[PDB]
Amino acid sequence: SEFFVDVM
Amino acid sequence: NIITVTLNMEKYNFLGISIVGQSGGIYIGSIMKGGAVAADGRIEPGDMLLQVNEINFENMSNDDAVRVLREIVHKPGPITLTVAKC
Amino acid sequence: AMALNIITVTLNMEKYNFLGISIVGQSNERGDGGIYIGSIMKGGAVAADGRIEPGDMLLQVNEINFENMSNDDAVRVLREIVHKPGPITLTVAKCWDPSPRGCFTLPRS
């Protein structure tokens, strides 16, 4: 599982 | 449940979501107060994002999916998200 | 323990307003592991610099230690940091081995 840091 | 959520993005310039990649697809991590997604209310953490504006994520890496999502949010106009309720 | 390489990268968040990375957590039963770079996306601050690579271990962000930090906290802290305007400094290690125990330990096999 990878957690994208930037909020969309 | 596959749901279609149309955000007119008149009052919000961002979705207010984070994304989680699984090795397969991209999923809602969390929903932020002040974004378009929270204003709609239907999408929940752990839902799977299938398409945005007729663009299917099944054909791309998770990170390419996030790039395309970011690009579509950046473009002025309404957003349609297709999500699978998990 | 020895380091393959340690680099410190200051990101201009004024020229690129988003980081453009994912993070991955590793941990074993024994408390070994950390926070690692997952994907680096073109168009973001990290890709432009070009030096950070997938699998690097995140040691510090601004003045915050990331070497003994839960995944939940790592994600929350990086967002708090990106959220507010201003430069971001990432210190990372290039890892010998991508296993929980392997960043600072030469492979023996």
Domain boundaries, chain C: 5-94
The Cα–Cα gap between B36 and B34 comes to 7
| Distances from the Cα of C108 to the Cα of C28, C96, C102, angstroms | 18, 11, 10
CATH of domain B2-84: 2.30.42.10
Would the CA dihedral through B59, B62, B66, B71 be positive or negative? Answer: negative
Q: Reported resolution in A? A: 1.4
CA distances to A7, B43, B83, C14, C106 from C24, in Å: 16, 24, 24, 26, 21
Method: X-ray
Instruction: Write phi, then psi, for C71 (nearest 5 degrees).
Output: -60, -45
* Chain B hits for A1, Cβ within 8 Å: 20-22
Residue type at B51 in one-letter notation: Q
Taking the C-alpha atoms of residue B71 and residue B75, their distance in angstroms, rounded to an integer, is 6
Q: Dihedral of the CA atoms B60, A3, C84, C61 (nearest 10)? A: -120
**Is the Cβ–Cβ distance between B29 and C71 less than 8 Å?**
no
Distance (Å, whole) CA B57 – CA B53: 11
Q: Which fold has domain C5-94?
A: Pdz3 Domain (2.30.42)
Query: Is A2's CB within 8 Å of C20's CB?
Result: no
Handedness of CA C55, C57, C60, C66 (dihedral sign): positive
Q: Are B71 and B78 in contact (CB under 8 A)?
A: no
Chain C residue with the nearest C-alpha to that of A1: C24
Residue C63 CB burial class (10 angstroms; 0-12, 13-18, ≥19): exposed
Chain A hits for B21, CB-CB cut-off 8 Å, are 1-4
- Choose from C21, C39, C42, C83 for mutation: most chain B CBs within 10 A: C39
